Design an enzyme around this catalytic site. Sequence first.
Site, PDB file in Angstrom:
ATOM      1  N   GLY A  97     -29.082  31.894   9.352  1.00  0.00           N
ATOM      2  CA  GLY A  97     -27.631  32.160   9.145  1.00  0.00           C
ATOM      3  C   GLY A  97     -26.817  31.237   8.476  1.00  0.00           C
ATOM      4  N   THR A  98     -25.549  31.720   8.262  1.00  0.00           N
ATOM      5  CA  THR A  98     -24.402  30.946   7.706  1.00  0.00           C
ATOM      6  C   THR A  98     -24.386  29.584   8.605  1.00  0.00           C
ATOM      7  OG1 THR A  98     -23.001  32.332   6.509  1.00  0.00           O
ATOM      8  CG2 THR A  98     -22.010  30.671   7.828  1.00  0.00           C
ATOM      9  N   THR A  99     -23.820  28.450   7.933  1.00  0.00           N
ATOM     10  CA  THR A  99     -23.564  27.205   8.647  1.00  0.00           C
ATOM     11  C   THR A  99     -22.362  27.183   9.415  1.00  0.00           C
ATOM     12  OG1 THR A  99     -23.161  24.790   8.291  1.00  0.00           O
ATOM     13  CG2 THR A  99     -23.924  25.999   6.203  1.00  0.00           C
ATOM     14  N   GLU A 129     -18.724  28.660   7.403  1.00  0.00           N
ATOM     15  CA  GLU A 129     -18.937  29.149   5.960  1.00  0.00           C
ATOM     16  C   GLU A 129     -18.949  30.637   5.820  1.00  0.00           C
ATOM     17  OE1 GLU A 129     -22.593  28.158   2.701  1.00  0.00           O
ATOM     18  OE2 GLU A 129     -22.915  28.503   4.961  1.00  0.00           O
TER      19      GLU A 129
END
Lengths: 243, 204, 250, 236, 235, 233, 222, 196, 198
Positions: free
Chosen positions: D22-24, D39
């Site tokens: 996933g996105t950070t 993010e």
Amino acid sequence: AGYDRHITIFSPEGRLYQVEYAFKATNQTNINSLAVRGKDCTVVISQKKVPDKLLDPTTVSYIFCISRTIGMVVNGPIPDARNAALRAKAEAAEFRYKYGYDMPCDVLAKRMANLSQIYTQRAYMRPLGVILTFVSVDEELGPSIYKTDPAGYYVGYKATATGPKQQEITTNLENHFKKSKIDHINEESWEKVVEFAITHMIDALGTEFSKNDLEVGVATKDKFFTLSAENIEERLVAIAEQD
Amino acid sequence: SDPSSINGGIVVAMTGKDCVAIACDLRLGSQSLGVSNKFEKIFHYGHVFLGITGLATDVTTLNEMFRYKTNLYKLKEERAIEPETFTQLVSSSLYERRFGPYFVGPVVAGINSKSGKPFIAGFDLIGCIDEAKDFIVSGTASDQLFGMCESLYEPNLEPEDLFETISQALLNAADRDALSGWGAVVYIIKKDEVVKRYLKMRQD
Amino acid sequence: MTDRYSFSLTTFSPSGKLGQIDYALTAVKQGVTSLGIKATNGVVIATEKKSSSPLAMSETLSKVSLLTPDIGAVYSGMGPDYRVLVDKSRKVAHTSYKRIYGEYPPTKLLVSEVAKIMQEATQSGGVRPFGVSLLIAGHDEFNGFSLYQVDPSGSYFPWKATAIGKGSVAAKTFLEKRWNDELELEDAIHIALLTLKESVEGEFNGDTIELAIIGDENPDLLGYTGIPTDKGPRFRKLTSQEINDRLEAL
Amino acid sequence: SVFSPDGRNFQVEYAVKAVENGTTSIGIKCNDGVVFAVEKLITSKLLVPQKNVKIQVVDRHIGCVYSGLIPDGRHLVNRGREEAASFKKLYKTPIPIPAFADRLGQYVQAHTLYNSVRPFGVSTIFGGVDKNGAHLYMLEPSGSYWGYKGAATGKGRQSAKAELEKLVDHHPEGLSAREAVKQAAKIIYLAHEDNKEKDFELEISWCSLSETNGLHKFVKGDLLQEAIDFAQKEIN
Amino acid sequence: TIFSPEGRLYQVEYALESISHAGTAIGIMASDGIVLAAERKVTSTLLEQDTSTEKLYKLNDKIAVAVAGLTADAEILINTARIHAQNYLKTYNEDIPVEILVRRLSDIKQGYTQHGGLRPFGVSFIYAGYDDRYGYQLYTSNPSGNYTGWKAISVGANTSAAQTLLQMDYKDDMKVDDAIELALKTLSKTTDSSALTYDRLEFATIRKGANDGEVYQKIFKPQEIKDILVKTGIT
Amino acid sequence: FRNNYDGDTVTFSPTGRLFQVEYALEAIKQGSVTVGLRSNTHAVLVALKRNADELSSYQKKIIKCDEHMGLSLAGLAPDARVLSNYLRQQCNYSSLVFNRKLAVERAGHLLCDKAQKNTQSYGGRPYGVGLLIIGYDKSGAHLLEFQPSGNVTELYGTAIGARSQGAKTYLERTLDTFIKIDGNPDELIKAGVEAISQSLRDESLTVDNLSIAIVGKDTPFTIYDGEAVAKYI
Amino acid sequence: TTIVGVKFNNGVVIAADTRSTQGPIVADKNCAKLHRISPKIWCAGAGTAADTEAVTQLIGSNIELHSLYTSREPRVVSALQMLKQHLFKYQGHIGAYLIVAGVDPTGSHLFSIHAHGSTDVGYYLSLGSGSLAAMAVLESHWKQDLTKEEAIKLASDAIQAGIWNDLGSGSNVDVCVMEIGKDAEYLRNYLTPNVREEKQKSYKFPRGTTAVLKESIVNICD
Amino acid sequence: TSIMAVTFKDGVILGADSRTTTGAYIANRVTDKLTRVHDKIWCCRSGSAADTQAIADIVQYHLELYTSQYGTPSTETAASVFKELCYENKDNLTAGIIVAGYDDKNKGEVYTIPLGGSVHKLPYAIAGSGSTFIYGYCDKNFRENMSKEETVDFIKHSLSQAIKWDGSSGGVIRMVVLTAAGVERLIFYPDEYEQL
Amino acid sequence: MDIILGIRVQDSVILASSKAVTRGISVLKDSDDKTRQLSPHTLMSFAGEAGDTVQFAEYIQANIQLYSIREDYELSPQAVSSFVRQELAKSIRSRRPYQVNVLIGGYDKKKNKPELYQIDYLGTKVELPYGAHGYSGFYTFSLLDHHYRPDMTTEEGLDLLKLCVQELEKRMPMDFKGVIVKIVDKDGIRQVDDFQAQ
Ligand SMILES: [Mg+2]
Ligand SMILES: [Mg+2]
Ligand SMILES: [Mg+2]
Ligand SMILES: [Mg+2]
Ligand SMILES: [Mg+2]
Ligand SMILES: [Mg+2]
Ligand SMILES: [Mg+2]
């Protein structure tokens, strides 16, 4: 991969592999714990390892205050550990409400072992990958250590140790009780029974400990409590002046 | 009205020397109207006797219920139920219906087939046990029965004499109650045999 | 939350075996020996305290259990399965019997109830059979003394004497050689101790052996006086010292 | 509900792979509060700016951010809200952060006990202000959670953790809410290094004793612009 | 519960397969009584004969069963059968007709055959009863929940051999004493043991009850079997 | 890897994937194309209806949810009915209890949470439909895209279904133009119909191929089919 | 009914009279109102007779199971907690009024329970229609630190006050003594001050007096 | 019943009489009406004894549980648990409870939960049948920040007046002092307080 | 009220039941058959609360007919009456009890005896030589106490019944519009169609 490897049904040998595998989970955290009985107290020591420096060290713990009188140290992954802690607390509070006295250590242990036995027998529940060490100064039995495992087995100990290096410490202690001939540490103050435990952990594991390497629980008549770094720091200085 | 008064009837049990006696009237009524001249209120299961007074629908039902439970008992236990034990089974069965009770006054008589001691007992409608060794009374003429019994009774009576006493108690107590009477049956029970006599009584 | 194994986990195989019952019986075999012997005036049940650790306190783990004042039990197989069966057996003696007839159940009936509880572990959805065999010894006014074996299938059989677990074939042999219908309880205890020595690896003292009787009534164990027709439990767990006393004259 | 021969749960380990995917997202603990940053990958010019919020509030004092299966996270926050309402109802006080931690903890752990459920495919960073200070937590798909000085998860977790370690080192004596917000913008910009082929939107929220009165608020307007500029300046 | 491509129920078949290893049980109906005989599973010297029942059970005062299969399964069914008989007696003030009880038990078995994903009961029954409608009666039921009526029948091991032997020697005018003889001969011939001794048998009658007009179930005691084993000439 | 791991929605793949959900996503790509786009005053749905036969009806892609809200479907039609009925109820409950029109955003959250429970429960499937939701609420025109995974994103424009990639690239190109068509429904519909064109290997879009819906500042959600779309082909 | 409970230096004592009544009528002239909860915890009840016996047997049964489960002697506070919670649940409908007394590992205990589920603790207590007569004797003679003998005397005297002055109480006195060290001693018919005088005449009838219609032997066997 | 709780400089004091009656009969002259639900959270009960004991027992259970999990509960938390129980079951409860407690943060606090199940935070509170006679005296004599000895005086005087006038009140005056020091039980016998 | 009498002679059981159905101030019908045949040799008559009366009878009829078909056999009078009693006994403690009183008349083929059973709505059952429900019993029990003989013929029983109906027509305040009379014997159940002026 047959069904006898995936759920708690018997194998042709009469074994329950899921239970056996659950025992393996207990060491997964690489933590060692030991518990000893004093004259009027019971002491639990557990290693405290904080690898990540992003962690708040105060929140990393495997010792739980179950009730006013009962402490529990867990060997196993934290999520399963916290599942058992919460249940034990609820069982402890309920026992008091229904029966008008504080739940004894051994009785809570028997009950937590019974819960474990059920996961051993019913298919849809997995065992918990933890070993539970219960301590108190029982109002009827004096200082007490009772230990439960994923099999639903439990018993009382003079002293005990749990974790990967369980054996080193066990034999260390067995050797002590071989000499002393009695089934506890002949000592009045808990402060000295804590020092003993730390010492015999040091000699068995061949390691020195700083104040942040340890976690201590003490159970005396009518209270169980944990020690802060400073009470531990004070205890490490005391052992250092002779040994 | 009051359910224990609708149908009428009495039961009395007494102990004697190595024997028990249990008696009841034969009346079944509907307030002032007498309906049945043949309504028995004593039953037995093996050697255990049970008379029941009160609402006749519950008298019948409880006989059927105790037949059922003693039948199962004998099958599982491979022996007939004893008076002491049966008494306890009556109690808990009545108490089970604590807030919807059977309107009955049961009476248990019999001899323990092992120890040989005579046994009687009584219950209220929710199964409280009256443990008395002399006599037990129940029904719409219980005041009259208590009176008769407290006067006529002495301990250790021979079966033939105990017969007279329990009969006289029943007959005269019956005759002071509008809702009891109409015939009477008396059981004289010894460890070895049981005699059953229909009495001649006032038919009014 | 909510089971996905609502079907029997013990099913029949093509040859007619019930696998899980067999596999559970194999678990009994692997277990520490226990035995019962019936005398004219009593019953004895005995077993070995095979300790997990020398740091453990073996008096805090009883293998022999009182079920009613006149009924006791012992097992071979899995300890935790026994422990829960005991709880349920005790409870069922109350709910199905004492709360009904105001007396404790005769042995065969309580045994029958235990057997039922184990039968159900063989048929219900999502469970495995219990991994134990029990020996149930007791007394009751009308049946006298008795001994029963109960297996993971829910079957029970009345025995004059038997052994279960590890050395059970050898021990059953030793008992067929020694048993007769004229035995006093002391004789039965003696035979029980002897039989158990062939099975026991390590130390053989009153600290490693666990032994209970169903004998005469112990009015000193009742806890109250006054009611003369209450005479006290017939079940009595012998003490460490009482055992050692009979091993000296063994 | 399946242990491997060595005592592992492969399903949970696979759940982690969805998180790592996933996105950070991050969380920084300051001297009197907590800061959350995430993010938001701009997939296409068609996504409306500022209008696909990821940071969620629980009660009034707790912020939650997650990386992994977004739906799984909303499921958790929903549960967290029910769990906090119930606490407030009985006890009048707003739920303490450790008490809230364990609530989520036990819920997540429950979804690893039974063969008819799958573990959650998220790691959640959450926390806020209670009766005795600021608390930051991170929670894995196994139900494991601990307290954190600083926390990161998702694709850029490695470089983010490296930046978090630096701050703990250069600032033992505290660190303000206003500073931590800036640093959050920086750390998210650096961690975006991996996914640099696609564009991203920044989202910061905070809960500070002296800056928000212990309430969880979104960083917006000038404060957000300031923090973006600081990050854009410290990237070049 | 599912069907095979042959239109057979796997679990039922395997249950029947299990039963063919159980001690043989024989029922014989005569004009003035019924016999139940069964062979106990290879026991031991130390088994208490006196306080043991593994194959013969009283259902009410007028009905009994011989069991072949899992005892624990059978006890479950026996207890519900006993209850069913008492419900009937409570509802009608008449002892339950034999067929009615048999059909009910059979229906319970059938149910496990058709829904619920529980395994069937590994039990076959021989029912021996009397009632004022059909006189003496003999029925059999098995895990399918099918039941049929018989003059003579066996269940468990060697039914094939036992059925053939009974077919040959049975006659409609038999007295009970003749039927006692037949049953023990048939077990003798079909046994998988050296000899058929008292300690390996359970035995019962349902006669016209000595002298009366009523019906008496006699469950034979060990010493009684030993005598009736001499009379018939097998010692 | 794809092996023993796609049996149900309750199983992760060693890659961290849920294949059942990924397969549900494929039923979308299989379905007929539909386009959504909005300005500040209006929002438009344009859908290509699909017949089974030249003797049959062209089946509906657009469903009305409330006076201020509706959706277009792509995938399993019966799943769209189940989801729109729920969305109809949530809109209803909002009116009745709170005298409030449900925010389009909140409709998004509700759909997301409903899809999610089906991606985590044994013996239940994910939903197999894509949805484009438009509405005019208290903060103007909105367009949402719903994926049976539970992912819902707010956009200015989008398209889902077979060959939708053309329209999506078109709208990406046309962004700055259509966003500004304020107070002119007919021009926003024109741009929508023109966007759906870039997704045709089919043909010339007919009077029966085409389905248009609009909602906006002073227009409730309304459906146009047949003769009423003629003026846009 | 008169029931009392008196604490003394080394334990606790309960006593009761032996009369049960159906309204004005005396059903049992010598019944036992003293009940066992466990060997060292005993119970006296007033109110609905069936209710007090049943609640005593229910809780007595569950206390046995607790004792076996826990490997401990039953405690009086557990008998109390279970009784009160049960009684409360039924809002007074189970008309049990109880004096519960006993010795357990934590010492000796004396408690009262009311049908609605309220409890109180004390050194001396009474219940039943006879409570006021006995309470007046208790309030007159109770001192701190009674011996066993003084306690038995006092409790016995209290029950007599009830026997002589309350029409609801009568016949004999039963006592139960519970000392901390020892086994509990139940003293059935401790006092028998109400012996019936011999009747003036014998009422035994000459045989034949009663007229019989028909007769037959009854079968028990089968 | 006469019951009260008063906040003062250092903490809070709870007081009560010791009489319980069924009609005009005194069932118990030495009742302890002061009930602990946590180390330093106590309450005074009035209304149905059955109801208030059952309630107190449940609250003590909830706060033992609270403490195992979340630490020491505030007096406000205690009060909320009481309210919840009293409000939610208002149809089958006659319960009037005064909640009093001491922690280090909020110092001394008093909450009153009358028949409806509402909660009221107050500097001091009176309740029970006997309280009605002392409304005027209490309002006239109460001050904030009183010393310990002054507060024991106020409660002693107030409850003696309440005992003097209300027949349902009487016996001994019990008190419980709740401060940082800890917990103190007090008793005052009739021969002391009547002479006031 | 509703008239429901029955008399057991030596070879049959006669039932007689009033023909009126009256609601308030109006007689709605004067040819009402207050009877259901349970089996070929068992008859039930009923009286009580307006709806419950027929509803209960037909319910019993459905159950007994079901038994006959399942067993291809006819339950004895004694068995049918126990089944009926138990139904009423369950009913008396339910939410809305059936307020129905019944007479059961049957010819037992196995014993070759007629049998009469009286059962009130409470589930009180008794076997009787003659019986009645409601007020009508207040006249007929004493009449039959005098007139009835155990060895009477079916014809003698009808005469006795003719006496009972005459009395009730003389003394009862309500006009019950005569009775429908039914005989149950070894050849089954039949209606005496002539009674109103026979
Ligand atoms: Mg399992
Ligand atoms: Mg599982
Ligand atoms: Mg009376
Ligand atoms: Mg009379
Ligand atoms: Mg991470
Ligand atoms: Mg008196
Ligand atoms: Mg006063």
